[PDB]
Ligand binder design. Structure first.
Ligand SMILES: *[C@@H]1O[C@H](CO)[C@@H](O)[C@H](O)[C@H]1NC(C)=O
Ligand SMILES: *[C@@H]1O[C@H](CO)[C@@H](O)[C@H](O)[C@H]1NC(C)=O
Ligand SMILES: *[C@@H]1O[C@H](CO)[C@@H](O)[C@H](O)[C@H]1NC(C)=O
Length: 426
């Protein structure tokens, strides 16, 4: 895609800190809105290239031509998208006029995503999930995106990281309007249940490490490997993921090895009220540590009290870290083989050894209503089935139109981001 400037693009500033054994020092960062949320229009006029959930036939006869003829424009972060920053804090509002949610990337500077090497390091952040009811997800996570949004590889992308291009994740999402410097107009099918989205002929795959998939009821920590570590484009049903006719037939693991303390049987650890170890009516600190061999450890802080990840017993596995032993036991007990089929912990560890981009987002779920996170799932399970229950939300909760109507002023606040070697951020 090209660049237009009907609206100036100014990335909201965001400070975070880089830490060593000696201490932490503040870094001047900034955030950028994902290209999919932007206005895409004619490079020569205000005619839309994409409106509602259909593309312009004239500007966008094919994927390459569309990217030459169409630009992304700037974002009114607060006014249009409900995105604001103050110092070290990022606030994302859910519904702002016609807009729902957002997805933001941490930038090193105006042209380049910040790239984090997770291996041997830890990431810490504070979060307020108090205003995230059933059906919402304030997700903070890492993906193996190209630092320049793909410009160096794809000349049809004139916009780059400055306009939030180049997204990929382990779902191999086909809802993206631009991938690899081409549009996704070819094969585009509008969504039956969302006036603003669709599914195209291509998707965009890469490794994903979900630090934080969460609301006030449930939270999950979930690596997802891909057969190719970095970003790759897929075609149609070969993408796998949710919007295909073969979820597991692609090159990524769309399921992940998830650690959700509720799912694992501790249903009084994280939740809304003072009886929970972590009271989600109040902000908390979340610390996630990546050993050099891919073992993931976790602890939390609230009111200055440190809580280790609760120990879980899953088959023969007992412990509180994600590793191949846990992930194999989880598969055995709960079902599925996707995580190991796609390379498992060794394969996601390759992503930890490379650069990954920090993503901060707020969304509802137009596929399955967030039930995978906070209710009983899949629908052909019951509460007895091992691992079926992932939170206390109703199985009728989380319908997007319902939560957008009932809870528009839901919000998440991410703050006090810290990164450095294991042991350094506290
Ligand atoms: C942008 O940040 C990247 C990543 O740290 C860095 O390599 C590069 O020098 C920066 N470019 C400019 C023009 O500041
Ligand atoms: C839930 O986790 C908390 C904190 O580790 C602990 O106080 C409590 O005993 C756990 N409950 C069970 C049943 O494991
Ligand atoms: C359970 O439902 C899933 C879809 O979530 C389906 O793929 C699977 O075949 C179903 N299991 C049974 C036993 O019908």
């Amino acid at each position: 895609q090209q660049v237009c400037t009907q609206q100036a693009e100014t990335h909201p500033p965001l400070t975070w800190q880089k830490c060593t054994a000696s201490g932490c020092t503040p870094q001047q960062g900034s955030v950028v809105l994902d290209a999919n949320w932007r206005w895409t229009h004619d490079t020569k006029s205000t005619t839309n290239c994409y409106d509602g959930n259909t593309w312009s036939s004239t500007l966008c006869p094919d994927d390459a031509t569309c990217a030459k003829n169409c630009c992304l424009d700037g974002a009114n972060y607060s006014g249009t998208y409900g995105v604001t920053t103050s110092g070290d804090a990022l606030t994302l509002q859910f519904v702002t006029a016609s807009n729902v949610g957002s997805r933001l990337y941490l930038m090193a500077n105006d042209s380049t995503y910040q790239e984090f090497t997770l291996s041997g390091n830890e990431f810490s952040f504070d979060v307020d999930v108090s205003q995230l009811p059933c059906g919402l997800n304030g997700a903070l996570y890492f993906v193996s995106m190209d630092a320049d949004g793909g410009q160096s590889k794809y000349p049809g992308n004139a916009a780059g990281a400055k306009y939030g291009t180049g997204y990929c994740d382990s779902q191999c999402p086909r809802d993206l309007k631009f991938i690899n410097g081409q549009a996704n107009v070819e094969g585009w099918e509008p969504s039956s249940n969302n006036a603003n989205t669709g599914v195209g002929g291509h998707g965009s795959c890469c490794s994903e490490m979900d630090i934080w998939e969460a609301n006030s009821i449930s939270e999950a920590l979930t690596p997802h490997p891909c057969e190719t570590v970095g970003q790759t484009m897929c075609s149609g049903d070969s993408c796998g993921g949710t919007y295909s006719n073969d979820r597991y037939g692609g090159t990524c693991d769309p399921d992940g090895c998830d650690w959700n303390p509720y799912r694992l049987g501790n249903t009084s650890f994280y939740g809304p009220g003072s009886s929970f170890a972590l009271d989600t009516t109040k902000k908390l600190t979340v610390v996630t540590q990546f050993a050099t061999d891919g073992s993931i450890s976790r602890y939390y802080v609230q009111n200055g009290v440190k809580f280790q990840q609760p120990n879980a017993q899953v088959g023969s596995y007992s412990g509180n870290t994600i590793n191949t032993d846990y992930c194999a036991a989880e598969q055995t007990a709960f079902g599925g083989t996707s995580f190991t089929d796609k390379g498992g912990l060794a394969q996601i560890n390759k992503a930890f050894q490379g650069g990954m981009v920090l993503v901060m987002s707020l969304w509802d779920d137009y596929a399955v209503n967030m039930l995978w996170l906070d209710s009983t799932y899949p629908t052909n399970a019951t509460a007895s089935t091992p691992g079926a229950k992932r939170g206390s939300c109703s199985t009728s909760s989380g319908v997007p139109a319902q939560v957008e109507a009932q809870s528009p002023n839901s919000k998440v606040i991410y703050s006090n981001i810290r990164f450095g070697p294991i042991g350094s951020t506290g």
